[PDB]
Nanobody, 115 residues
Framework: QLVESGGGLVQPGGSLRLSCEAT????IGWFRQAPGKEREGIACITTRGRTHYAESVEGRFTISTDNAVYLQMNSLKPEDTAVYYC??????????????????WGRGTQVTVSS
């Protein structure tokens, strides 16, 4: 029901905009997974437009809702290399972006930052 696009290969300092497009009307989060690491929630937005960012991307990435949710990725770093996924998510404070229970992960879009 959620479909990712917009990945690519970019030099350090570059910029990409990922899209998460719903097959119908629709909290949404962006997640990423690097080789050998756990999937991590990096940005999410509630049904009302309140956002949360992981510390690794705050100030460089922006999540925006339009039937699509975008991730504007500015000032890309090699450590941003990963497959990026979008899924229903909740902002869980104890504060993390957490995938909704029972979420089915799609295919995602590949992002590689290298010179």
């Amino acid at each position: 029901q959620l479909v990712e696009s917009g990945g690519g290969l970019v030099q350090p300092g570059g910029s990409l905009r990922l899209s998460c497009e719903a097959t119908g009307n629709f909290g949404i989060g962006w997640f990423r997974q690097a080789p050998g690491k756990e999937r991590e929630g990096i940005a999410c937005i509630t049904t009302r437009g309140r956002t949360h960012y992981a510390e690794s991307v705050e100030g460089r990435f922006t999540i925006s809702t339009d039937n699509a949710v975008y991730l504007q990725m500015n000032s890309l770093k090699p450590e941003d290399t990963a497959v990026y996924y979008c899924a229903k998510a909740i902002r869980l404070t104890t504060t993390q972006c957490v995938a909704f229970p029972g979420v089915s992960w799609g295919r995602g879009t590949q992002v590689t930052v290298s010179s």
